[PDB]
Amino acid sequence: LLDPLSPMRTMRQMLDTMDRMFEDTMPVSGRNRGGSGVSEIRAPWDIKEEEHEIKMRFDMPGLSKEDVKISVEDNVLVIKGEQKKEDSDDSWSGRSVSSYGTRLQLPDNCEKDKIKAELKNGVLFITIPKTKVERKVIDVQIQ
Amino acid sequence: LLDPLSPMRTMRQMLDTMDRMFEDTMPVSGRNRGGSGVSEIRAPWDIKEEEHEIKMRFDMPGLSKEDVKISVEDNVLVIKGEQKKEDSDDSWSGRSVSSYGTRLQLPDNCEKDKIKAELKNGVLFITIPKTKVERKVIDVQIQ
Amino acid sequence: LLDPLSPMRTMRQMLDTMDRMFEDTMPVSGRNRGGSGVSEIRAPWDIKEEEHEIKMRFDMPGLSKEDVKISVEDNVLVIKGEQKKEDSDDSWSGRSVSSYGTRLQLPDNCEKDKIKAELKNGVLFITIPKTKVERKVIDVQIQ
Amino acid sequence: LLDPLSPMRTMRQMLDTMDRMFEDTMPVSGRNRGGSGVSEIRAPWDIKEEEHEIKMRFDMPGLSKEDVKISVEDNVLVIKGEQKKEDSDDSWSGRSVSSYGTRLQLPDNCEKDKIKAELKNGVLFITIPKTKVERKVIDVQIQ
Amino acid sequence: LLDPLSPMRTMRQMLDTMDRMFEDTMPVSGRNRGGSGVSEIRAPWDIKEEEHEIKMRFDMPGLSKEDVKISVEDNVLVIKGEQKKEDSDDSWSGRSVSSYGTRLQLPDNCEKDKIKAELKNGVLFITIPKTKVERKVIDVQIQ
Amino acid sequence: LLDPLSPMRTMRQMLDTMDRMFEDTMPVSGRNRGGSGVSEIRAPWDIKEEEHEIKMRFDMPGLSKEDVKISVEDNVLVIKGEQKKEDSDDSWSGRSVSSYGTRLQLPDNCEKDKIKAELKNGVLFITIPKTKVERKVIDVQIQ
Amino acid sequence: RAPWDIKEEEHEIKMRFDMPGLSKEDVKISVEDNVLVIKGEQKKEDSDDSWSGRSVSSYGTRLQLPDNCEKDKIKAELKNGVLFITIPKTKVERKVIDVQIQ
Amino acid sequence: RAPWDIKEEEHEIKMRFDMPGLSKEDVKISVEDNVLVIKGEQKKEDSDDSWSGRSVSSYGTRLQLPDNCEKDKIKAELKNGVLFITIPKTKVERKVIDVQIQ
Amino acid sequence: RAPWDIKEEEHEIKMRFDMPGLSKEDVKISVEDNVLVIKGEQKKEDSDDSWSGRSVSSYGTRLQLPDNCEKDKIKAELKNGVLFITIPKTKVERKVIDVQIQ
Amino acid sequence: RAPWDIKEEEHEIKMRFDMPGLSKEDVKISVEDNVLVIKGEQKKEDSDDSWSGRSVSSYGTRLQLPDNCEKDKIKAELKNGVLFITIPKTKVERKVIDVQIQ
Amino acid sequence: RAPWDIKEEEHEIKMRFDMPGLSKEDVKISVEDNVLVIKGEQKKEDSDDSWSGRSVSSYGTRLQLPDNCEKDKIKAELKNGVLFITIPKTKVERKVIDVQIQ
Amino acid sequence: RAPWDIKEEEHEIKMRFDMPGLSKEDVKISVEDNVLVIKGEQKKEDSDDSWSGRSVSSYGTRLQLPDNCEKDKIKAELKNGVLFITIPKTKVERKVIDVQIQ
């Protein structure tokens, strides 16, 4: 499950990937990435103030809504699908698309009724409405 | 399925592993061996004239006959099993044993009734009786 | 023969170097580049509309016109030469210059009389006049 | 020219390959071996007391005496040849044989009339008769 | 001793690091850098016209003037020190600081009385006053 | 201090080098061996029943007893020394000998008076007398 | 990214492109110097819209046609972030493949 | 650069930062989405002043607090080019370490 | 091959060995120089019987006991191709492990 | 060393071997378990005679015949340090190769 | 790029530079701090003119003279895209080379 | 192991060997084919005696003399596990070395 909070990624954070985790296993010796299957669909995520109206696009060119699914399980988002197989005289109109599933941990449990998904122009969008918060106001210090 | 006829192994044969197959992929970049799971049980195979009274031993120290299975599927031998998990105060009396399945292609379809398997001293034996043949007599040439 | 049409180079093209050709032989294990001998003379090529008035410069500092040759063979351009050897008290005025030959496939057969070559300031220029064409007009599509 | 005296090879000698020469260029980065072309014909050399009646065999299976040559140039032995090309329906009877030339520095100038070469059973032999010498007698020391 | 004149560093200079020195030992096989100990204190150097009023800062956050030393030996600058060890309940406030010594060759012998060192905000500064010179005027050539 | 009991070496033991220690740091990235300095003097150790009459030879060809020292510190053996430097017209009679110190942990504290060291033929010997013990008798099991 | 395919009817470039976020206005197909050319530029879209992958720029691909290709009968289609170019061969000739299929 | 430490009283982020050349004005500490945030920008200083190391930019660090951390009792101190953040634990619990010391 | 384990009651060498095809006659356990020793030799068996793995030879393992181990209370068991050695500690002390389990 | 070749008439193993210094007595060709077998041993020769390359031993090669090969019509020839084995196919079928040749 | 050479008469920097496309106006030779300096900038030229190689920028080289070099007798020549600097030695001393030549 | 040295008086092989545990009986020095040869065999010694390093075997080294070396004036000495061979040059010629020494 992608989790943006998770210590494993580099941001400016505590973990700092460059530390023990990146230095320890700089080679990817062992389990595969699944980077082949997620190359099928690159997806971002933006958080707006009103929503994780998930600015989660995914690029599935030539995909039909029967072949994709948006689910929530454990209150976590799931994206999965696969382009149809080739017909006898299929115009590929592509490189190999297949089998992928991606999961993103939302910061809060979503209302499943509030989430909208649309597919247009080969692009899924998924909207997650979030609750209104002041956000924890950030106090300032002086030098 | 281990197959001793198969071109992939080195013997003196046609394939000769050292050729294109070994030179092409000298690194094991890609799929795993399953060499971890087969390390659980190293097994030989000898062929006697009377039988592939399979001189197929397998070393499963501390294994119970409930945990192992000998099957024939597609008329091919199958060995599989796994030592039980640890009890609360289990004397390990081991390193990690787990999950393995090995398959050997027999040169002929076996009579399933004729095969005997025994487990003793931590050793499976499996006997496959074969049919009587003259064998193709080998003609000699002179210099 | 450098050929800008050739599938081996990366441009945006069909071949796409990053595919099978670059992935297959990412190491240069085998034949040498000749990149040592072409380092003698780096040469570009620009195509103007009026001509492949070959905007083919070559940098041969300290070279004499006896030492360089411009030829056309098979209607293909050839550049070759080598700076003279060292005299007893030669002021090098250089690093090692030597032995090179480069060839560029022209898109059309050149008129050998029309080509001009000049050497000035350590720079060869070679001009190839081309035939007048409308060029294949590019049709536009709408979204 | 193979020279058994030459410092580059390991024997017990002064050079000792393991020193600066082997440590300096342990990788073969640079010029090719010609080890591909000499694989065509592996050849030993034995020295008998009577002669470098060169116990120089070479393995050229299927070779004709037209295709091989034994020459002496600079009073050095030369072996060269290449199996004929393929006919339309040639039974190969082989792997690729081609183009090789090997040279061995004799310890003394040979009498060209005295050298015999024979080809039989796919094997060249070359005999070099040497001059009679006492050899430098080896003095013994005591402990 | 860092020496900015020294042939080992890359600038535009004669040595040119990319030559024999960098190509010969591109791997750091052998002696350690001391790059671990100098990471303690990164220090620049600027030369102003009035002085090598050494625009040599060093970052020693949390350091006391007892722990650092500025010395001149052989008329060369020396920086050295180490943050104190940990107390029982020390607020770290750090990563590991320890043991370092850096030396910079001045272009001229310094007057030891003229040099000022200050520590403020975790930053050493060291000022070296230099003698007044016209500098060797640079003559211009025309094309 | 070489210690034959120490888990780091391979014998048949508990540690088993091939485990975590050898697999973890199969490359020697980090501290140097001192394998250069101990190459000066290769030394074995045999234990006889009567003594670690240390069958500790060391090969110091051309060494003088002034240049070597045998010490016991912490009741541990120490070997150290270095061949003299070169005189103006020294017959080397060698490759570079220099600076080494080796230490071996004895299984028991030695009586310093009982230890003998001799140097002859370029060979140190050191004798450590040990105390008489029955040794822990080894009980036998039956199958 | 662009694959090269063969059909019996046609190749040269039986090409695709992965063009996602392009308008057909922003794309040009052409044959220049008798070579296929696909070019264009990526623009911007809605700030509501996301993309993970490569950034935006101009882009411009060049393919060697057979000298005897039907340059005139070239077609290009764009759907769902892909372009497809078809160059008709002078003669339809499938590669024969003898695979065991009933 | 930022280390993670544990004390008995407190962790979450018993953090430092190496902030050299920052003013406390230029720094912000915050908890947003119940995650610690440290951000700011490096400015310029005196041309008399030197720095070897990384350059200047904005910078901005994000740390997952325990859900039961005292967000209210977070403190931050800056001295000599370091920031120290302290998040009080809900219960002081030292990691016990049984090391042979008298 | 031989694992090192710890129990509360005992370690030193809470050891195994993988001894397959050994008779208990062919094995010796001992403490010499106050170090554990396991040695023996592999023999031959029935030609009906197979083994894939390492070959036969002598074998002989040496383990540093704590100076305060019960050398007297050492036990060794062999079953199904393994040896187990147990050295009683002078004091039973489990390593404490604080894992969240009910 | 042994190459695998195909002819129209025959393959299975349209094999060679590099057998140099073998007598046809020392060689055996056979089909056992319907698999081709080539075995033999290298002997010694004249001390006048030289060889650079691999040493002498037994040697013994095993090739999977098509189930529908003519085992009966297998032939083997030895000349000049090579063996050639021919297995007739049940049907002569050349691989077709469409190369531009006049 | 710049080679270091030695002559009997002179070195220090018996230097070249590869300066192609530079005017002698754009170049400066100097000794500053008793160190040789070669600097300048590359400009633009005719659009008719081609260059393969590195791009244009400023450039600026620094060479440690012997303390006893003739700084006064330094000469610099530019021809055909190279600079040559000559620093006269205080004493002409060829490196002797004993090579077998008649 | 054997170093090559040069003196003014002599080289060819101003050689050593590391011969430890050899008797001068077991060693032969010779010139054969005008090449230096050093050979011998290592034997056994006292069981009281230890050696760490390489094992025992025959050993036998071959060095190309200058054609104009004094083969007659070759000397060999063995002391403390080393052999030293000296081949007198036809003319004493030191390599000159111009190093700054008073």
Residue numbers in the entry:
A (entry chain G), B (entry chain C), C (entry chain J), D (entry chain A), E (entry chain I), F (entry chain D): 42 to 184
G (entry chain H), H (entry chain K), I (entry chain E), J (entry chain B), K (entry chain L), L (entry chain F): 83 to 184
Give the original sentences from the paper that presented this experimental model.
The small heat-shock protein (sHsp)4 chaperones play important roles in the cell by preventing aggregation of destabilized proteins (1–3). There are three structurally and functionally distinct regions in an sHsp subunit: (i) the conserved α-crystallin domain (ACD) that defines the family of sHsps and is shared by all members; (ii) the C-terminal region (CTR), with a conserved (I/V)X(I/V) motif; and (iii) the N-terminal region (NTR), which differs considerably in length and composition between the different sHsps. In this study, we describe Hsp21, a chloroplast-localized sHsp, which has a long NTR (82 amino acids) with conserved methionine residues that are important for substrate binding and scavenging of reactive oxygen species. In Hsp21, the NTR contains a unique set of methionines in an amphipathic α-helix motif.
Here we describe a structural model of Hsp21 based on a combination of homology modeling, cryo-EM, cross-linking mass spectrometry, NMR spectroscopy, site-specific mutagenesis, and small-angle X-ray scattering (SAXS). Because the result of this refinement exhibited a relatively clear D3 symmetry, we continued refinement of the reconstruction in D3 symmetry to a resolution of about 10 Å. The reconstructed density map of Hsp21, obtained from a data set of 18,407 particles, showed that the oligomer is ∼10 nm wide (3-fold axis view) and ∼9 nm high (2-fold axis view). For optimum fitting of the Hsp21 density map, a relative rotation of the discs by about 30° was required, and the distance expanded between the discs by ∼35 Å. A difference between the structural model of Hsp21 and the Hsp16.9 modeling template, however, is that the Hsp21 dodecamer shows a rotation of 30° between the two discs, which are also further apart from each other. The CTR tail-to-groove interactions occur only within the same disc, and the interaction between the discs is instead modeled as a direct CTR tail-to-tail interaction through an extended IXVXI motif. The resolution of the EM map is not sufficient to determine the exact position of the residues in the IXVXI motif, but the model clearly supports a role for these residues in making crucial contact between the discs through hydrophobic interactions. Indeed, a V181A point mutation disrupts the dodecameric arrangement. The SAXS data on Hsp21 are also supported by limited proteolysis and NMR and by positive density in the cryo-EM maps, suggesting six arms in the dodecamer interior and six arms available on the outside for immediate substrate binding without dissociation of the dodecamer. To summarize, we have obtained a structural model of Hsp21 that fits both SAXS data and cryo-EM data, suggesting a division of labor in the chaperone activity of Hsp21 such that the CTR tails maintain the oligomeric structure necessary for the chaperone activity, and the NTR arms take part in the interactions with the substrate proteins.
